[PDB]
Amino acid sequence: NNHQIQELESNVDDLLHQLQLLKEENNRKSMQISEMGKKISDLEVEKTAYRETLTNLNQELARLTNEEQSHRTEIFTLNASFKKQL
């Protein structure tokens, strides 16, 4: 008819626009995925740094409190053993 060519013109125009917009999206998404991949690696090693220091300091803390305790006990035993002789 008198419309049959103008039909494809507009259609082709659309496909080629959409495929512009989508190649654009795919690009913005590839970039965001790169940046998020890096953020994940960074957070993972920062989490590991805090965890490993936490567990190391927990061990020292256990060690000290166990000492402060055995020392606190021994000084109470001697101080009662003092007044029982005196």
Next chain:
Amino acid sequence: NNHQIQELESNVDDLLHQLQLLKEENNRKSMQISEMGKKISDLEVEKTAYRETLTNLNQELARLTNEEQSHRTEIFTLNASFKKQL
């Protein structure tokens, strides 16, 4: 010519295939972005949990070591002050 219609047939076929493959990519990427967004939030709060415990235990550790030190000093001062009278 005798080629001019078969030309668009194959072309249109391509655009419509590519736009299939790209709508597919955009979908796989939207999903991966969702999962990475969540992983980032999870790692951020796990990092915070380790950091806040680390800083709390560091304070207790400082407190103990300062005590164990003032106690260790005082018991050396008294023990030298002992043998100087005796």
